[PDB]
Design a protein around this ligand. Sequence first.
Ligand SMILES: Cc1nc(C)c(C(=O)Nc2ccc(Oc3ccc(Cl)cc3)nc2)o1
Length: 112
Amino acid sequence: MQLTPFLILLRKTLEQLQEKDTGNIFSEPVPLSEVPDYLDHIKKPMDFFTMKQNLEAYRYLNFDDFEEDFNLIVSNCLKYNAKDTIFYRAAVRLREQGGAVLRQARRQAEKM
Ligand SMILES: Cc1nc(C)c(C(=O)Nc2ccc(Oc3ccc(Cl)cc3)nc2)o1
């Protein structure tokens, strides 16, 4: 398996995941200026912009590690936010819609 087609697939998949985040609440790191206690509870923050940086820094050489950082976006949000919030429901919706995107992308990868 050659590296450039795989990275092309991951770039497309990250764009498709970002599209499911129609509110753009997962596109950038959670702003500590507004949420100063965020790092007290969340030990590995993650967001789609950071994922894009990691992608280009070759830190995703297999689908599992890509999907792991996507799962962090979801679990950080379920963890920090109360169940009755918009943020929490948005993470539940991203988990569902994002899982479908990831499953189709993984089959594409498995064909390479
Ligand atoms: C996935 C997730 N978990 C959390 C806890 C958050 C989160 O707090 N997001 C967030 C916070 C602030 C902000 O900008 C402003 C919003 C309102 C005003 Cl008045 C000024 C700036 N934009 C996004 O996102």
